[PDB]
Scaffold this active site. Structure first.
Site, short mmCIF file in Angstrom:
data_model
loop_
_atom_site.label_atom_id
_atom_site.label_comp_id
_atom_site.label_asym_id
_atom_site.label_seq_id
_atom_site.Cartn_x
_atom_site.Cartn_y
_atom_site.Cartn_z
N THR A 1 31.03 7.68 57.64
CA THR A 1 29.85 7.22 57.00
C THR A 1 29.08 6.44 57.41
O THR A 1 29.63 5.73 58.64
CB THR A 1 30.53 6.66 55.84
OG1 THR A 1 29.27 6.44 54.70
CG2 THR A 1 31.17 5.17 55.87
N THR A 2 27.93 6.09 57.09
CA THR A 2 27.15 5.02 57.74
C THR A 2 26.00 4.38 56.75
O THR A 2 25.56 5.28 56.19
CB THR A 2 26.09 5.87 58.81
OG1 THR A 2 25.12 4.87 59.44
CG2 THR A 2 25.39 7.02 58.31
N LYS A 33 27.01 6.18 47.54
CA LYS A 33 27.50 5.31 48.48
C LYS A 33 27.11 3.88 48.09
O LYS A 33 27.49 2.73 48.81
CB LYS A 33 27.61 5.58 50.02
CG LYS A 33 28.75 6.47 50.16
CD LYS A 33 28.57 6.94 51.58
CE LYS A 33 29.52 7.79 52.05
NZ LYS A 33 29.41 8.59 53.14
N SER A 130 31.40 4.69 60.27
CA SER A 130 31.68 5.30 61.68
C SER A 130 30.47 5.54 62.39
O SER A 130 30.35 5.58 63.46
CB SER A 130 32.31 6.60 61.46
OG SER A 130 31.74 7.37 60.52
N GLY A 131 29.21 5.64 61.64
CA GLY A 131 28.03 5.76 62.10
C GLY A 131 27.26 4.50 62.48
O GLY A 131 25.78 4.41 62.61
#
Lengths: 203, 220, 196, 122, 212, 221, 203, 217, 212, 196
Positions: A1-2, A33, A130-131
């Site tokens: 996700t970012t 999110k 993670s981004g």
């Protein structure tokens, strides 16, 4: 996700992707999110989805009890510190929550980054997931304190989209929120499948 | 998988289902699990596929070369011993395991070969995941001097039991009848579970499927 | 990783510590002030885990302020350092905190005083200290040109030299540092050292 | 553990224990507070300075925090317990929420603790 | 598994149990655990099936070569030493325990036990396989030297059946192989022919024949 | 770890009642330490269960069920546990003790008939349970449910039931290496009550020419 | 593991007298998207194509090595190699490294003989899976199996086959995070070879 | 040494619509490669307008179903009201999460009508997160069902700000047929699914049960 | 360790070896493994020497309380069930086999095996310890029902010495306890009084006696 | 640990790389130039274990030079990249080198090219490349601003921006980067980005 957020002249933006991926498989791309803790406060999901959701319901409940008891709406600093403590009581339990708390106190905007092990930061621009690397790569270039709301939202969209493009675990609709004096409002959600071909026209 | 071998009065009957899987998903609904080694020898492979085809093919070639060299028809003991000598020297790393059958100058033969080279000589054999489901049927219904039709019935019953009762193996039943001279092979003898649904109106591909480029070649 | 180092000069003490806030490989904040005014005349620079650092130093500040209210007379620096050591030791075998502490403070009568406390609680009145990977360069430099009566401007020149060496010779050289001083007039922030 | 209803209703609906607590208050050192436009002046009547009393070590008006100051009337021994509880909770509020307490929050907390003591057993 | 070898006046009576298992499943119920090396020498295979089988094959091969070279019936001692040549040579890989019995004009009937690891021990009798342990106590009080082909046969049957009745790894039919001056005589004793030991009942087709 | 463990316990709902069979063996690793351990018991008026797996744990389950059934009986209010409630209690206890990482190591086959509704079900050592016409545990779940499924009938007679159940149990005896020839069939019926067969052993067949002479020759084999 | 170090999706599917082979189009360290134009499908000759899912490096090595052998066969025999023969060759040269295997999951598809389609995929050590309806390989294995099982038809013209393989590949890759970023589909008929590049989700 | 969990297989599917919702799952239990029973129902009706379909470990699935019945009965008694579908959904999320550190091995899918009557579907994971969706699938055959369900029942994500419309909802019969084809093509290619299909259709006129015979191997 | 109990027509005759080993060193060579629990009941202790004796002590204590409260000697069944209480409730902590034997006026001489895990199995005879494997076959072959005192005692002696002779962990003397209506009696048989089995020679004070 | 990245302009292919050579925590050197010249018209930036990086790069340069003199015509860039990939892939299973390679070059008849070669020996002709922790920032920023026709001014501006971000956001941010350009004139050094 970012996910990302940043304070600027007219408030704090928050932008996030919509992609839940376990192993190598896309569970869904409708996962919301950006959790609204409060008509003037947004919490952002990142890391563990179950952990984030449960503890943000707990935080919303604590904030509502606080509003009831004190007859006054809790501030962003208070909510951030509450969550940091709550998480710290479970430091060794293997929680995976890390989330920006974005809101407009009585004393101007606020943006804190809270972590599964009690790590709390007051910052001016954040990005998690993670981004995160690409989110920073793009966000830091275009960021200026006085950029107006339209181009601020555009910057958040572009940053999240680039994290999406270069990252396996990030994708889906690009949700962007605006938190200002009169609370928060959603500004845009644009499917990256169409956002990409908006950005690099085929021709 | 489920593979089976039965020695009836005249010869040796082999059987096997036709499902091949890769984990919990069936890769191939109709697999060919009974293999040819010689005009009087066939073998059902169980265990690691690559190894089973590799070893059975290598032994088939060796056996054909020996058939030329000696002229006379190859016998099963030769295939068994070549398989042993190959499987052992690789210490079970090559994980091929077979049921081997044939008819020779000495009469019907049926052996099971395991990846380490351990072999058996048996009146009825079973292997693969459904080996227990098949051996139920064999230990209940086998007897000496079954005729060809009864023997094939029993083998089909065993394979059906190993189809319906074990998830590793399924699909359709295949059988190879090895009498003295003729080997009656059945590509799909029993198809016991057809497709349960028709799908009515075929579903339409709404999205026109945008395409960016199309190189085209006028193949001669 | 978090680097902090201290020093005792003429009538003051000086604590310097990097101000990066790092996740695994990412610098979320390059403005994180890691030296807290424990009291009007004490500083507590810490180096450890972010959660452990914040929670423990806040706990010790709670106790310090409670003592100040309860008795009227603030804890003396030696007492504050001994209390910190005691708490960290009692937590050592139950639920360890992973912070290293450097506590400086000016006590009206004794004078300046830097104290070194480590993850396993070991206190020692020291005239120079350092935690983190930059401790090597910090200690070598300080041992080289330090004087027991080394004044403010020259002590800070020494601290600049230590910062520059840490920043140029460490693989993980942190860009920004904060220099905090404590003397007769109370703990304060001495100029921030921006690098970016 | 000693649990018994020390505070119970009398036939007329009164809490004689609370009424007696009020009696005890009415005999304690008089205090007064006045709220101004920009200041809040408290005060109290100490017992004779000429009498050999060293008042350097204890102040009749005390700080529950650098922003909250408290004056009591009644049992001097109990005041100390209230003060300690209030101070501890003021710092605790600082420690869980970054903000320091408002005056009304700490007043409410002290009153709640004081009432709880009037209903729990023993 | 069980493998027993008994020496009587004239020769040997090697024995076996017939149950090759792969876990708790009985992969084979009539395995032949006694193999030929020459017309007068047999080995009771035990332990790993593959290893014992190939050692049997290689010993038979070497021993064919030897008996042609000499043009003479190979002796038991040589068969046992050939088995040890591979059992010891390959301690690392071959997890095999074997008993070699046979007959010679030179020395008569001899039993050589080649336990796991590759020792040769000439013995009046040998016991092997996981089912051996249930027999040490019985054999020690049973062995009488110099028996006939009969008494030795009964003793081998008793030993293997007692091991069968109590060991999970041993069962099926008892196979015996009588090796003598006149030559090998292979036998086959199903469970039905073996006696009935402590707390065992007589087999019956269906409970419908007794009711309950 | 399991120390003294038993083996398969097959189960077959037949006309007018229920039949359960289980050998009398308790094995210790590879050895058969015990060969006369009645591993079928009658529970209450309407039930009957057999167990596989650790025999200490089974003996404990019998104490649990005996207290349960005695407490149920002493009420004398005219209602009692049928097979269903007893099996549900067993599932609950087995699952609860799994949640403690302190399992009862047994697999339970419980069945019975009450009010003309005949029930048969199973429970695993970790709470997995299901009720079916014919159940088995252990290798009876590999080598007996194929033949049970193949041959079970809606109105199986008592004798046909016994013969099927012996077919299954013999097939196990051939190829289990944990099973002893001693075994019991338990009959439960309405208005007859539970009735456990006396121990007995089944005749077995080995004289096949392929067995007598693996391969074939005047010398070799 | 090592198969999903790069991540790929390849499919093959049989039409009336035409064969179609599809694939993904992206190279990735693991989740980094270095290049959105990777080639997993290689033409060896008209009417024979190989798709090489799995590790990218193993794929390139096997492709170059296979070209060596195929050209030398053309010079020595003067006939392009028939599909089934090529599948047997690939199986042999994969099994030679039985204990050092290439981490590829090749898909082989090509017309031949009397214009008769051929498809098969193989284990990493050459176990062939000669199929007749369709074949699927890569990280999207399960998703491709479902999509093709639900979308296949027995005998399909070239245009229906193109649309079906395209929809199957795209719908099956959208449910995979290690694959996507376009598509590369061939429709091979005994008179024509059409090589299509598809518009995909770039996220 | 024992394992505290087991994959007992099966598959579930749910497809909500204008005024209905099709929770449908298979009937099979497997321990490794042998079938335990061919009649293990996975659908559990928790309330007059809610239907829980779960796959995974059977003991955990059934413990969860019984626990949810208990909690719902307590809800009924305390509030004199039957607990609406979204309330059930959040309750199930909470109950899954409370065992965070010893999770249920149950992959759940709710369904049914929200109080106004529009069908819902909530998809969960073993730790307890959930999200309202229009269709869903979980179990051994989920990854095979989802590609096909996605391609025929696909519409703009509800997060596009200038909402861009949606496909006309498949009416009930289309939904039953789509579920049937999904399970046929899933049992064709997956080994843990089959032996029967249990279709449960929840609607304004009450819920109906139907079946379709999948293959037996 | 070898521990055995056998029932005869008027009681039981429990018997055990005497070797406690800490590796390959016999730490005590005359250990007493038949611990009293009551005038009626003795229990042969196996497994770890701490668990077995602590269980024995606790069941002695329980039998002392129970018999006094009841006013009658404790049955054998009660003693076996008390041992099982401990050995099972502490299934996960205790590593000890046991054999409870005795005579009581109700059910007569009885024997209850309690192997690891605590499974009370009433038996005619039971065996435990490492040295039970060597006796399984001998006692399937040799058990009889209803022997007299002499026959049962002699069988116990033969069985335990047969275990001593082949078992590394068993050795020393043979202790037997004969519980019977007229009371307990404890016998002691040095290795000298025990028979000689296969491959054993008469003992000799020195070699200067034979060689010279 | 190393960072490297490339960029293909209209007639040039830039390669930049950090120039810090380290051991564990010490920057033994900050002038370590890592971008090699294979030819008058090739660059080969490498990242990986320093010993393996140097040995493999030297081996490949030996083979390139051997080809050049023996035939008289230099290896074309694509052939050099493929040869590198072949050697690396063959070593992969026997004695693997742990080097990641970016190869740029210019050939009169083809123009600038930039190849991606991973330590797994995956070869791809990329438009833009990057290796190491700085890869995330480099790739995101290039994607954001990259075009297919950049003037060397624009390409160098982009590389400067990438360097600034890599310094600002990495924890192992190396201070010094070297920028090398390949054009019709030949492989060359463009500029050195001193920070310290």
């Amino acid at each position: 996700t970012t996910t990302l957020a940043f304070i600027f002249k007219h408030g704090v933006m928050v932008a996030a992707d919509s992609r839940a991926s376990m192993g190598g498989y896309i569970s869904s791309q409708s996962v919301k999110k950006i959790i609204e803790i409060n008509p003037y406060m947004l919490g952002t999901m990142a890391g563990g989805a179950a952990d984030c959701q449960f503890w943000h319901r707990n935080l919303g409940i604590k904030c509502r009890l606080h509003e009831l008891a004190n007859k006054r709406r809790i501030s962003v600093t208070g909510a951030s510190k509450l969550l940091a403590n709550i998480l710290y009581n479970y430091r060794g339990m293997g929680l995976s929550v890390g989330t920006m708390i974005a809101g407009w106190d009585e004393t101007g905007p606020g943006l804190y980054y809270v972590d599964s092990e009690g790590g709390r930061l007051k910052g001016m621009r954040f990005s998690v997931g993670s981004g995160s690397p690409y989110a920073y790569g793009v966000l830091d270039n275009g960021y200026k304190y006085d950029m107006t709301v339209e181009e601020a939202s555009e910057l958040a969209r572009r940053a999240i989209y680039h994290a999406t493009y270069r990252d396996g675990a990030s994708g889906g609709v690009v949700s962007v929120y605006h938190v200002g004096p009169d609370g928060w409002k959603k500004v845009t959600g644009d499917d990256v499948g169409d956002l990409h071909f908006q950005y690099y026209p085929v021709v | 998988t489920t593979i089976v071998g039965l020695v009836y009065q005249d010869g040796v009957i082999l059987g096997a289902d036709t499902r091949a899987t890769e984990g919990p998903i069936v890769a191939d609904k109709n697999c060919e699990k009974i293999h040819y080694m010689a005009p009087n020898i066939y073998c059902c492979g169980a265990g690691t596929a690559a190894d089973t085809e590799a070893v059975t093919d290598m032994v088939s070639s060796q056996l054909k070369l020996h058939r030329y060299h000696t002229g006379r028809e190859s016998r099963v003991i030769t295939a068994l011993t070549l398989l042993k000598s190959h499987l052992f020297r690789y210490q079970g790393h090559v994980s091929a395991a077979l049921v081997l059958g044939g008819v020779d100058v000495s009469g019907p033969h049926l052996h099971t070969i395991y990846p380490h080279g351990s072999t058996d000589t048996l009146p009825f054999a079973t292997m693969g995941s459904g080996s227990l489901a098949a051996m139920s049927v064999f230990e209940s219904k086998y007897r000496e001097g079954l005729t060809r039709d009864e023997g094939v019935k029993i083998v089909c019953e065993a394979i059906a039991s190993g189809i319906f009762n074990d998830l590793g193996s399924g699909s359709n039943v295949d059988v190879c009848v090895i009498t003295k001279g003729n080997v009656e092979y059945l590509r799909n003898h029993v198809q016991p579970n057809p497709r349960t649904y028709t799908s009515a109106k075929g579903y339409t591909f709404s999205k026109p499927t945008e395409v960016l480029s199309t190189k085209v070649t006028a193949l001669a | 990783m978090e680097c902090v180092f201290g020093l005792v000069g003429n009538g003051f003490a000086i604590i310097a510590a990097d101000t990066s806030a790092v996740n695994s490989i990412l610098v979320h904040k390059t403005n994180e002030d890691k030296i807290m005014k424990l009291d009007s005349h004490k500083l507590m620079g810490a180096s450890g885990e972010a959660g452990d650092r914040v929670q423990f130093t806040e706990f010790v500040q709670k106790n310090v302020s409670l003592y100040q209210f309860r008795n009227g007379i603030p804890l003396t620096t030696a007492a504050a350092a001994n209390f910190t050591r005691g708490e960290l030791a009692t937590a050592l075998r139950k639920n360890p905190y992973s912070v290293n502490i450097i506590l400086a403070g000016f006590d009206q009568d004794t004078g300046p005083s830097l104290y070194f406390i480590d993850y396993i609680a070991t206190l020692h009145k020291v005239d120079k200290a350092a935690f983190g990977y930059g401790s090597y360069f910090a200690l070598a430099m300080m041992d080289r040109h330090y004087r027991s009566d080394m004044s403010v401007d020259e002590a800070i020149k020494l601290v600049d030299e230590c910062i520059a060496e840490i920043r140029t010779r460490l693989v993980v050289a942190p860009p920004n540092f904060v220099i905090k001083i404590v003397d007769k007039d109370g703990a304060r922030e001495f100029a921030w050292r921006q690098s970016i | 553990r000693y649990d018994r209803a020390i505070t119970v209703f009398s036939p007329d609906g009164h809490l004689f224990q609370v009424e007696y607590a009020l009696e005890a208050v009415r005999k304690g050192n008089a205090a007064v507070g006045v709220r101004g436009t920009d200041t809040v002046v408290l005060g109290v009547e100490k017992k004779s300075a000429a009498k050999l009393q060293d008042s350097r070590s204890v102040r009749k008006i005390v700080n529950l925090d650098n922003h909250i100051a408290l004056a009591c009337a009644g049992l001097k021994a109990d005041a100390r317990v209230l003060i300690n509880k209030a101070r501890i909770e003021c710092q605790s509020h600082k420690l869980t929420l970054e903000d320091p307490v408002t005056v009304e929050y700490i007043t409410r907390y002290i009153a709640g603790l004081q009432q709880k003591y009037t209903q729990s057993g023993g | 598994t069980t493998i027993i070898g008994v020496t009587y006046k004239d020769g040997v009576i090697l024995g076996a149990d017939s149950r090759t298992s792969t876990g708790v499943y009985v992969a084979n119920r009539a395995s032949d655990k006694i193999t030929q090396l020459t017309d007068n020498v047999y080995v009771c295979r035990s332990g790993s099936a593959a290893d014992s089988q190939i050692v049997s094959d290689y010993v038979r091969y070497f021993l064919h070569q030897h008996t042609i070279q000499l043009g003479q019936p190979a002796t038991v001692k040589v068969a046992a030493n050939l088995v040890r040549l591979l059992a010891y040579g390959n301690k690392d890989t071959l997890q095999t325990g074997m008993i070699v019995g046979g007959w010679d004009k030179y020395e008569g009937g001899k039993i050589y036990g080649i336990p796991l690891g590759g020792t040769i021990i000439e013995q009046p009798f040998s016991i092997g396989g996981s089912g051996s342990s249930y027999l040490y106590g019985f054999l020690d009080q049973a062995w009488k030297d110099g028996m006939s082909k009969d008494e030795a046969e009964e003793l081998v049957k008793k030993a293997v059946s007692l091991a069968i009745a109590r060991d999970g790894a041993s069962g099926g039919v008892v196979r015996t192989v009588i090796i003598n001056e006149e030559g090998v005589t292979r036998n086959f004793y199903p469970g039905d022919q073996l006696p009935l030991w402590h707390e065992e009942l007589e087999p019956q087709n269906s409970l419908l024949d007794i009711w309950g | 770890y399991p120390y003294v463990t038993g083996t398969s316990v097959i189960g077959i709902k037949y006309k007018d009642g229920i039949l359960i069979a289980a050998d009398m063996g308790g094995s210790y690793g590879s050895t058969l330490r015990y060969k006369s351990v009645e591993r079928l018991k009658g529970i209450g008026k309407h039930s009957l269960l057999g167990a596989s797996g650790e025999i200490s744990d089974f003996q404990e389950l019998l104490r649990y069920l005996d207290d349960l059934i005695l407490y149920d009986n002493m009420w004398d209010d005219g209602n009692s546990f049928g097979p269903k409630e007893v099996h549900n209690y067993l599932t609950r206890v087995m699952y609860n003790r799994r949640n403690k990482f302190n399992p009862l190591w047994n697999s339970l086959v419980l069945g019975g008939v009450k009010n003309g509704q005949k029930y048969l079900g199973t429970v695993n050592m970790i709470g997995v349970h299901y009720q079916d016409n014919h159940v088995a545990t252990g290798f009876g779940n590999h080598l007996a449910v194929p033949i049970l499924r193949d041959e079970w009938k809606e109105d199986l007679s008592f004798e046909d039931g016994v013969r099927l159940l012996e077919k299954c149990m013999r097939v196990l005896l051939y190829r289990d290496r944990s099973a002893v020839n001693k075994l019991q069939i338990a009959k439960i019926t309405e208005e007859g009550g539970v009735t456990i067969s006396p121990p007995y052993s089944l005749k077995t067949y080995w004289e096949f020419a392929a067995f007598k002479n693996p391969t074939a020759g005047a010398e070799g084999s | 593991s090592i198969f999903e170090y790069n991540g790929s999706a390849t499919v093959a599917m049989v039409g009336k007298n035409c064969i179609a082979i599809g694939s993904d189009r992206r190279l990735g360290v693991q989740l980094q998207t270095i290049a959105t134009d990777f080639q997993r499908i290689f033409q060896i000759h008209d009417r024979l194509f190989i798709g090489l899912s799995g590790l990218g490096s193993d794929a390139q090595t096997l492709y170059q090595r296979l070209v060596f052998r195929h050209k030398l066969y053309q010079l020595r025999e003067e006939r392009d190699m028939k599909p089934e023969t090529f599948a047997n060759l690939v199986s042999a040269i994969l099994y030679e490294k039985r204990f050092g295997p290439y981490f590829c999951q090749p898909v082989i598809a090509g017309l031949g003989d009397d214009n008769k389609p051929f498809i098969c995929t193989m284990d990493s050590i050459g176990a062939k899976e000669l199929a007749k309806d369709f074949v699927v390989a890569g990280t999207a294995s399960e998703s491709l199996y479902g999509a093709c099982e639900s979308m296949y038809k027995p005998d399909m013209e070239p245009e229906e086959l193109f649309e079906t393989v395209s929809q199957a590949l795209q719908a099956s890759v959208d449910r995979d995070c290690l694959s996507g970023w376009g598509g590369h589909v061939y429709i091979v008929t005994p008179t024509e070879i059409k090589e299509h590049i598809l518009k995909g989700r770039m996220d | 040494n024992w394992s505290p969990y087991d994959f007992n297989g099966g598959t579930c599917v749910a497809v909500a619509g204008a005024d209905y919702c099709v929770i449908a799952a298979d009937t099979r239990m497997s321990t490794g490669y042998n079938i335990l029973t061919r009649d293990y129902s996975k659908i559990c009706k928790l309330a007059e307008k809610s239907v829980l379909a779960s796959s995974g470990f059977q003991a955990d699935v059934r413990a969860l179903q019984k626990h949810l019945d208990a909690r719902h009965l307590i809800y009924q008694h305390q509030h004199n009201k039957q607990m609406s579908c979204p309330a059930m959904a959040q309750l199930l999320s909470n109950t899954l999460y409370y065992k965070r550190f010893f999770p249920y091995y149950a992959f759940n899918v709710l369904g049914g009508l929200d109080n106004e009557g529009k069908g819902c579907v909530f998809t969960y994971d073993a730790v307890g997160s959930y999200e309202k969706v229009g269709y869903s699938s979980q179990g051994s055959g989920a990854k095979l069902i989802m590609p096909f369900l996605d391609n025929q029942l696909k519409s703009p994500s509800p997060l596009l700000i200038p909402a861009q419309d949606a496909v006309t909802p498949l009416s009930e019969s289309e939904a039953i047929d789509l579920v049937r084809t999904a399970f046929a093509s899933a049992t064709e290619r997956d080994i843990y699914t089959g032996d029967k299909l249990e279709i449960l259709v929840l609607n304004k006129e009450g819920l109906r049960r139907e079946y379709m015979e999948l293959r037996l191997d």
